[PDB]
A paper describes a structure:
Substitutions of His109 in MsmUdgX with Ser, Gly, Ala, Gln, Cys and Lys showed the loss of its covalent complex formation with DNA but gained canonical UDG activities. However, H109 substitutions by Gln or Lys, showed poor activity. Both Cys and Ala mutations of H109 showed intermediate Kcat/Km values. Further, the overlay of all the structures of UdgX H109 mutants showed that the overall structures are very well conserved with a Cα RMSD of ca 0.2 Å. As anticipated, we note a clear difference in the sizes of the active site cavities in the various mutants. When we arranged the mutants in the order of increasing cavity sizes (left), we noted that the canonical UDG activity of the mutants increased with their increasing cavity sizes to begin with and then with a further increase in the cavity size, the UDG activity declined (right). It suggested that the initial increase in UDG activity (H109K to H109Q to H109G) occurred because of the efficiency with which the water molecule could be localized to make a nucleophilic attack on the C1′ position. However, a further increase in the cavity size (H109S to H109C to H109A) perhaps destabilizes the bound water, thereby decreasing the UDG activity.
UdgX excises uracil from uracil-containing DNA to concurrently form a covalent bond with the resulting AP-DNA. Structurally, UdgX is highly similar to family-4 UDGs (F4-UDGs). However, UdgX is unique in possessing a flexible R-loop (105KRRIH109). Our earlier studies allowed us to propose a reaction mechanism of UdgX, which involves the formation of a covalent bond between H109 of UdgX with the C1′ position of the target deoxyribose sugar concurrently with the uracil excision from this site in DNA.
Numbering used by the authors: 2 to 208
Write the structure that this text describes.
Amino acid sequence: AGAQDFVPHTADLAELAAAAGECRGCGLYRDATQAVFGAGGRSARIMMIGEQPGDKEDLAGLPFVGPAGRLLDRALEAADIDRDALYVTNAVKHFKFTRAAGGKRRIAKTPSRTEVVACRPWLIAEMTSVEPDVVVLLGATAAKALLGNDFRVTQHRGEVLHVDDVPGDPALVATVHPSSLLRGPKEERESAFAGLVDDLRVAADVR
Ligand code: SF4
């Protein structure tokens, strides 16, 4: 099933990342430039999971390098969370996209639940390798990957969650994806930014 046979029997993140470059667990490896594995080290206490690598990530080979990554950096700084404590990754590891004539970027397309479930073996390997105390789920795709396809991020803000089939029973905090805070009226963006900082502080205060 899915990516499972492509995942080697190791918790070494460099070896896992190299193996993900050879993954054919769903169709997304075909058009993407490369797999984008998570970044950070196994001592990280906080793991953060987004949806997928975007246009800039697909070419950088690293998660959270675009405008949404810069906004997340601003929120992490505001939450007094250092990168040293972080392992950051995405629910799926290959960019799914299309282009529009006149566009200034490749347009991210939503991974199907089928793709998320196919790629989940990599997320499980990362979680087994890092043993985080807390997992921050950025957006619906990531939150549903671990909490269920019916899960609604909008209904559980600020809440520390724990589910049974997650490796190591870490705390889980589901929040908005930073990409959503880039647009909208100023007062709504400012209120949303504050709520993202609040959710990051909840996660950082676990244990
Ligand atoms: S998105 Fe995940 S399962 Fe699909 S080919 Fe890429 S690494 Fe494999």
